Amino acid sequence: MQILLANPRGFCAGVDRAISIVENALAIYGAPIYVRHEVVHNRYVVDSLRERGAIFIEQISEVPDGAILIFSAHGVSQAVRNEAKSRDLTVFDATCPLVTKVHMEVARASRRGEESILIGHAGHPEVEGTMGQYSNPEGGMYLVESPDDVWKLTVKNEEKLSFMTQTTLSVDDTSDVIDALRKRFPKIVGPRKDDICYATTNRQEAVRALAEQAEVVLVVGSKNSSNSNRLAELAQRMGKRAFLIDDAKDIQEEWVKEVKCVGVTAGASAPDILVQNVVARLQQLGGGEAIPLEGREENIVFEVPKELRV
Numbered sequence: 001m002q003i004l005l006a007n008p009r010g011f012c013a014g015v016d017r018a019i020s021i022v023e024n025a026l027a028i029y030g031a032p033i034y035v036r037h038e039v040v041h042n043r044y045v046v047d048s049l050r051e052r053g054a055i056f057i058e059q060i061s062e063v064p065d066g067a068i069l070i071f072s073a074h075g076v077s078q079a080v081r082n083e084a085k086s087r088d089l090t091v092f093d094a095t096c097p098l099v100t101k102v103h104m105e106v107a108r109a110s111r112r113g114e115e116s117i118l119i120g121h122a123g124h125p126e127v128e129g130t131m132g133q134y135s136n137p138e139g140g141m142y143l144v145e146s147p148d149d150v151w152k153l154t155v156k157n158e159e160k161l162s163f164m165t166q167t168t169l170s171v172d173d174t175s176d177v178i179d180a181l182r183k184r185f186p187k188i189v190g191p192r193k194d195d196i197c198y199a200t201t202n203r204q205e206a207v208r209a210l211a212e213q214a215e216v217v218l219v220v221g222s223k224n225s226s227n228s229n230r231l232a233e234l235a236q237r238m239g240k241r242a243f244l245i246d247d248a249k250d251i252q253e254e255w256v257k258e259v260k261c262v263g264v265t266a267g268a269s270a271p272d273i274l275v276q277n278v279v280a281r282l283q284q285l286g287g288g289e290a291i292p293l294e295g296r297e298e299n300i301v302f303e304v305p306k307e308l309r310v
């Protein structure tokens with residue numbers, strides 16, 4: 001049984017930075033370091049930081065005066081950001097720069113009183129944070145998940161309209177939404193394509209390459225990780241058996257079956273130890289040596305703020 005590894009896979013530049021922000025704050029200030037919601041959507045990473053002294057909280061309310069507070073990679077709304085400002089807290093922001101980039105566009109639209117439409121998934125923290133950059137009653141900020149949502153939408157002035165996207169969306173699905181948007185609203189302004197990040201685009205291209213080769217695809221990642229669910233869905237959609245798994249324990253022999261070729265990838269918040277565990281398990285189920293697939297170069301690094309360098 002052949003074992004293929006997708007490339008690129010696993011940590012993105014934003015996840016690397018967010019984790020180093022927490023790890024360095026712990027090294028500099030000692031435990032506890034308070035983090036608002038999971039720093040990234042991976043339970044292995046979150047468990048490991050919590051063991052080292054990070055306390056993951058829900059509400060700024062729960063953080064005592066004088067503490068160190070960290071915002072997650074997904075970003076926060078202005079309301080949350082202003083609440084922390086009003087408190088006696090030291091805050092470091094681990095929001096990925098490629099999310100902040102979207103936040104800045106939503107803010108510009110807001111000051112102009114022009115309506116904006118965000119393509120994303122309701123309930124996701126990144127969406128709460130991006131929608132929460134808009135604050136002008138004369139304009140409006142609307143969320144759209146699907147092409148139908150686009151045809152349902154009523155807008156005050158379709159001559160002054162723009163859109164933005166969540167970073168971790170299906171590129172193909174998002175294209176379908178954007179098509180509807182530009183047909184339904186011909187004067188809508190946007191990016192050339194979308195706000196889907198390099199890491200998502202690349203990971204979905206790598207899993208498509210993987211899935212054309214493999215009968216079964218295991219994607220390493222947690223259930224609340226949007227980008228990891230998009231990986232599994234992409235492979236599933238090409239008619240392959242895909243499974244989102246947190247670790248090697250989750251692998252069921254029935255999946256490995258009489259499969260001639262199994263592929264493994266990882267979402268942007270999953271550590272590579274976990275894919276190595278998965279390979280070790282697959283080899284004990286008759287897998288051979290792991291063959292890495294060739295991939296697009298990634299060369300982007302985002303640095304920790306200077307106060308947190310170690």
Ligand code: F3S
Pocket residue numbers: 012013014015073096097098099167168197198199200227268
């Ligand atoms: S928006 Fe940023 S945090 Fe990772 S998944 Fe994309 S590089």
